[model samples]
Target chain A: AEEYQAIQKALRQGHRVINLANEMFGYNGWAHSITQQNVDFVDLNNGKFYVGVCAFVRVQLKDGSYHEDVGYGVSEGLKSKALSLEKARKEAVTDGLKRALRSFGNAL
Target chain B: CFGQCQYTAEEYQAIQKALRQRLGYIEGHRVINLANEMFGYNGWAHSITQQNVDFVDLNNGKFYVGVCAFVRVQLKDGSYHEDVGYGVSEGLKSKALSLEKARKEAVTDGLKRALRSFGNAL
Candidate 1:
């Protein structure tokens, strides 16, 4: 519990962070074993930002940028496991990219 | 794709050796009984009852395949009570490594190619 709290605190207010949240209280990050956040940009018919959650947190910040850091971690596996993981990541990113661009009227 | 492994033309002698080894592999097994008595081969044996180079059809791509697993389809409603199934073990799950839609298409393509090859061979 303490460890999870520390991570949660660091993610929200650490110095060396690179947060990519689009809005305050936006539901993102630590959602699954493989993925940490979401960057939803569309009104998913339910108006809940379906799965856009792109909000890319790869932005680096120092101690002053604690609010910007999101620790996305993945396990080390070989061969089939690694291949499946890679496949899932690629597919999620591709699907998320489509969802991410939904708000920006089809870049003419 | 359907167990059609590569065997080069120059590998005939080695292929014969491998074939003999495969005969030994299933020597004690009941493949002969299963293929003969169960499916009754009525061919005239040369009194030796020895086997010949054989051919058999397979739904090679079908996952979880067995005559016992047939799906019953009904065009009308209310007769829709059907038994769903799942794998009994990790090995059984792997025995079902087939994707249903992909397997059907692969089977059709395999049949087409195999028939074409046999037709040309004749």
Candidate 2:
């Protein structure tokens, strides 16, 4: 309960979720990796949406147990003006990790 | 097709500086503040597309109040993004407090991630 409360307090105080989780759970207590990703083109009729990545991430705990989740990210606007597609894929993986970690507590 | 509407080089540079110096792995409030500064107050918006609470029990005899949320963010130029987030409050004595905390945290997480799709915001 004390640890849980500490985490809640840190979250309320605006600490980054990943940092707080690392601090409380020990850096070695958690690990994550992207298992799969795919990119697609979505047209919104605004002459934008070059790439969208769906990332499947697996989060492994200290006990070697794991959970998985999927996250999506997109790059909009023309190719010359859009956000980086690579960054969007990275974001999707991180987002998936956050989603998977939340089952253990507010670790996200 | 709204043609090519993108951030100016100066704006991109400012965003990079903010991400590198002023913010690192930003929180929800900082993400919102950055969006307001870059896009103006009315330039960006977010909505909760889905949300729910769950009472979960673990094999270790622990329980938690969990919340899952989906948030969508829309920029002024009609570009939009979406993401899912989850939050849980474990071993809280009060169920109500746990529920409330989990709910808000989930939404904040979703909002921040959706905003991060813009790049240089996370």
Candidate 3:
């Protein structure tokens, strides 16, 4: 019960931190692991670019069961273009994780 | 200007049903599906002529990302229509993601508006 609440709290915090869609967090499990699947890039000309990250996430439920899902994230605005490629890549990873977790349900 | 094709009664009915189901806002997928159904897959197409993305400061220590897109819809008969669309997303922790969503939304919106000129309301 406590563990479930903690997981829910973490999800709420993560959703706000990531600025995802405003919705309730409904996942009753915690992420057991996450892996990067792929990276894609889109060039918008004039040094602007979009970095997309695909992630594989595994969630473990209280019932001793697990589920896996895939999520995608992209780098945001001109700010990302101003940063170094390495930093932008890191941001994409975080974004991807949040997206993957959100996929567990309609609630973000 | 070129000669335009007319929509059959069934096609018009389908368009109206789609709009009614979606509450009058046509989504990008619906637009494509209707275009393919009405004009045939190779009969209609769209291209983005211009796109721009920027950041908007809300004065409350927060921001949003905005994208503006111009799209042209062309039919096989050489009839073409154009429109502009705008999209915005509240600033997320990652600016890159915000821009990405805004830009896609803008392009989709532009495509829908440009096609709407053809009476499909897509």
Candidate 4:
């Protein structure tokens, strides 16, 4: 839970994370894959197909900080890129807060 | 275990109906068969990942899985010859199954079990 706490602390410091993928990404996620299939879907493919699923993130900020986890993968593929994806994933949550801050720029 | 994954819509009257069926089927679960030779790798992914899980396999049967790996038990349960072992990740924790049939045993089964174990551990 430290990672979650870190995310929360960052939020207090005017930083936030946005769950970009979960919002419109898909009905399934990596967390679910670990459960039902009893292994990471990527391992199931035996190096045949893409991971269990693929997802990404992008950032828009008023503070001008910007980045995205798009185009990340273990192989030569683009859609499944972004190792340590949760890092960028957590950024998605912050990006949500950033949008809020952007809207209230003058007020903040 | 017994299961009939409704990976797609199940001719539901409404979203609420679909949601209830999906959750209920998952919560309840039972399996058996000695037809052993029917097992083949890539059966699941080959069915769904081909980009047509919706209408394609729907008539036959379909339920999308979200994981990538699993480890299985027992080596080829058939007269077909092959051998493999059990360890971890890719069936590294394995040893030869038999002496006469040892030369031909394929590691496919063990690999699946390990794959299953790793995924379950998660």
| Top candidate by TM-score | 3
- lDDT, residue A85, candidate 3: 53
**Candidate 4 CAPRI classification by DockQ:** incorrect
Write one digit per residue (lDDT tens) for candidate 4, span B1-122: 01223323543234324223321111100101111111211011100111111111122232211112122232222112112332222212111111101111112232333223212220
Q: Residues A1-108, candidate 3: write the lDDT tens digits.
A: 565555444443354733343223233323356544555455565556655654444544334333233344555345455453555556545654564343333234
Ranking by DockQ: 3, 2, 1, 4
DockQ winner between 1 and 3, please give it: 3
Query: Candidate 2 has which clashing residue pairs, if any?
Result: none
**Candidate 2 structure quality by residue, lDDT tens digits, B35-67:** 655554334555556665565454354447777
- lDDT-based ranking, best first? 2, 3, 1, 4
User: Model 2 over residues A1-108: C-alpha lDDT tens digits?
Assistant: 466456444433323778867876677677777666666334444555455556666665553434345566655554543455656766766666666565444324
lDDT at B113, model 3? 74
**Model 4 superposed RMSD (Cα):** 22.1
- The fraction of reference interface contacts (C-alpha pairs within 8 A across chains A and B) present in each candidate is 0.00, 0.00, 0.03, 0.00
Judging by lDDT, tell me the better candidate of 1 and 4. Answer: 1
DockQ of each: 0.01, 0.02, 0.03, 0.01
Off by over 4 Å in 1: A1-79, B1-122
Give the Å shift of residue A38 in candidate 4: 21
Question: RMSD for each model, in Å, please?
Answer: 27.0, 22.8, 15.3, 22.1
Against the true structure, whose DockQ is highest?
A: 3
